Design a binder for this molecule. Structure first.
Ligand SMILES: *[C@@H]1O[C@H](CO[C@@H]2O[C@@H](C)[C@@H](O)[C@@H](O)[C@@H]2O)[C@@H](O[C@@H]2O[C@H](CO)[C@@H](O[C@@H]3O[C@H](CO[C@H]4O[C@H](CO)[C@@H](O)[C@H](O)[C@@H]4O[C@@H]4O[C@H](CO)[C@@H](O)[C@H](O)[C@H]4NC(C)=O)[C@@H](O)[C@H](O[C@H]4O[C@H](CO)[C@@H](O)[C@H](O)[C@@H]4O[C@@H]4O[C@H](CO)[C@@H](O)[C@H](O)[C@H]4NC(C)=O)[C@@H]3O)[C@H](O)[C@H]2NC(C)=O)[C@H](O)[C@H]1NC(C)=O
Ligand SMILES: *[C@@H]1O[C@H](CO[C@@H]2O[C@@H](C)[C@@H](O)[C@@H](O)[C@@H]2O)[C@@H](O[C@@H]2O[C@H](CO)[C@@H](O[C@@H]3O[C@H](CO[C@H]4O[C@H](CO)[C@@H](O)[C@H](O)[C@@H]4O[C@@H]4O[C@H](CO)[C@@H](O)[C@H](O)[C@H]4NC(C)=O)[C@@H](O)[C@H](O[C@H]4O[C@H](CO)[C@@H](O)[C@H](O)[C@@H]4O[C@@H]4O[C@H](CO)[C@@H](O)[C@H](O)[C@H]4NC(C)=O)[C@@H]3O)[C@H](O)[C@H]2NC(C)=O)[C@H](O)[C@H]1NC(C)=O
Lengths: 208, 208
């Protein structure tokens, strides 16, 4: 029979208010004369009606896959609202309800540390500036790099890494050209998380 | 019908003689009264007869799961030898050949750097020393931390991270009580990977 998969908004949508944090409910495995199924949504047990439900998409494996996206506020999601996608079929003994919400647990503020290169690497053609971030719970978080004010193109971030106390940690690397490093340019890692002042913090450094 | 999953030896075991590196062939979904099945092993198209096989392990979900552990040398694996576990069944008609071998690609030497704490952190009651390993390939790699010879209990390590050029990178944090950091001690990272001198390299640092 068919199967439901409810998904959470992005750790970056949930924090900033320019983007829209959304909650996506998905159905799969709806056979070929199973008529339309119907999203009933509920937030903490009351029916909202603003979910932009989409059409009935065909799949390579000849199934029907259905989606309903539902916009939510950041206030709401981070207050621990319990969002629910109920689905009735036309050809299924039951209706299927799934529910989702923010992670439970006393949120913990990280602290950011920029780290410089190593005195070994400074002679190299490029160098690796390091943003260590640690102590953060919940695991959902976001990092960016900017330079003089202008944002940075290329960098790489590890997935969060569970720590021995139950907090999470991660590292982020930034390759910068040996050329561009020296002339006292100034570089800054910036981090977004539930438990920050303005949900936002930066460290920064120079060639000192 | 039944399915066959072949699995390689882990990087640590592939890198030193002390340990024994193994190639594991696992069949799952051998049904209720379908009798035994055989492993026919081959190495680059020649049959070896040394796999320490175990007998049929029945599962919760009511199938028969079978395993054969074949042992290899390290020179064998790093020469890129192709190992195959073929399965005769007494049920579904076919043989099921499955093949495994080392990752293809010109190996790259991991360049490793210890990084000290950040000035910021020092007033905390613990500190975080950082081993950064970059530019390595294949992704199979092992990191350990020791101090005055003795190894370390707490050390976390990110899973490798694909880089913009195709090499991999990773980080490792070591938390040490500040009571251990600042009375004159020496600390050391240790890295293992095929494209190295003696498949092993280490950096080290101290309160200078
Ligand atoms: C027919 O095809 C469809 C379409 O898929 C396509 O089919 C064929 C043609 C191939 O080409 C496929 O390669 C192709 O993808 C099949 O639909 C699939 O159905 C399976 C189930 O049979 C679903 O499995 C689930 O997967 C989700 C993860 O799905 C996300 O991530 C995938 C990649 O990571 C991505 O492909 C998906 O589209 C989806 O992607 C994310 O989507 C969100 C929302 O849009 C988006 O914001 C993200 O950015 C995006 N991410 C990425 C990386 O793209 C997974 O969550 C499920 O795991 C849980 O459930 C398992 C039980 O099935 C269980 O074993 C797990 O341990 C895990 O347990 C859960 O844990 C959660 C969280 O930790 C927790 O709440 C619970 O404890 C627990 N919950 C549950 C319910 O168990 C699950 O594995 C596929 O998502 C789905 N694919 C697509 C594309 O929709 C269909 O099955 C096929 N039918 C047949 C008969 O074969
Ligand atoms: C009945 O149950 C059994 C037992 O499982 C258990 O059953 C129930 C009771 C629950 O408790 C389960 O939670 C529990 O697991 C079922 O047996 C399972 O069968 C499925 C297949 O149906 C297997 O799926 C495959 O999984 C492997 C990974 O398996 C490793 O990792 C698991 C955890 O991550 C671990 O549980 C396994 O034991 C095994 O563990 C590893 O083992 C090695 C060797 O011993 C060891 O060195 C490792 O340290 C160890 N690791 C860990 C973390 O423990 C996965 O590789 C497969 O994925 C490939 O294939 C998929 C398609 O099947 C495909 O979607 C993927 O993309 C992927 O692609 C392959 O890989 C590469 C890279 O992508 C690609 O280049 C290849 O070309 C491609 N090849 C193929 C062929 O696809 C796959 O997902 C389970 O492992 C297996 N579980 C166990 C424990 O054996 C049984 O199926 C059940 N039967 C029924 C009817 O329900």
């Amino acid at each position: 029979g068919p199967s439901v998969f409810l998904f959470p908004p992005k750790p970056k949508d949930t924090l900033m208010i320019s983007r829209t944090p959304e909650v996506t409910c998905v159905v799969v495995d709806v056979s070929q004369e199973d008529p339309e199924v119907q999203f009933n949504w509920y937030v903490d047990g009351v029916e909202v009606h603003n979910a932009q439900t989409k059409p009935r998409e065909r799949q390579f494996n000849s199934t029907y896959r259905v989606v309903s996206v539902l916009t939510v506020t950041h206030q709401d999601w981070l207050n621990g609202k319990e969002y629910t996608c109920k689905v009735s079929n036309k050809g299924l003994p039951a209706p299927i309800e799934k529910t989702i919400s923010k992670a439970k647990g006393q949120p913990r503020e990280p602290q950011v540390y920029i780290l410089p290169p190593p005195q070994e690497e400074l002679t190299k053609n490029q160098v690796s500036l390091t943003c260590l971030v640690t102590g953060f719970y919940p695991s959902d978080i976001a990092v960016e790099w900017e330079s003089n004010g202008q944002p940075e193109n290329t960098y790489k971030t590890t997935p969060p890494v569970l720590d021995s106390d139950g907090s999470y940690l991660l590292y982020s690397k930034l390759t910068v050209n040996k050329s561009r490093w020296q002339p006292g340019n100034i570089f800054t890692c910036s981090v977004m998380h539930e438990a920050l002042h303005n949900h936002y913090t930066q460290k920064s450094l120079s060639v000192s």
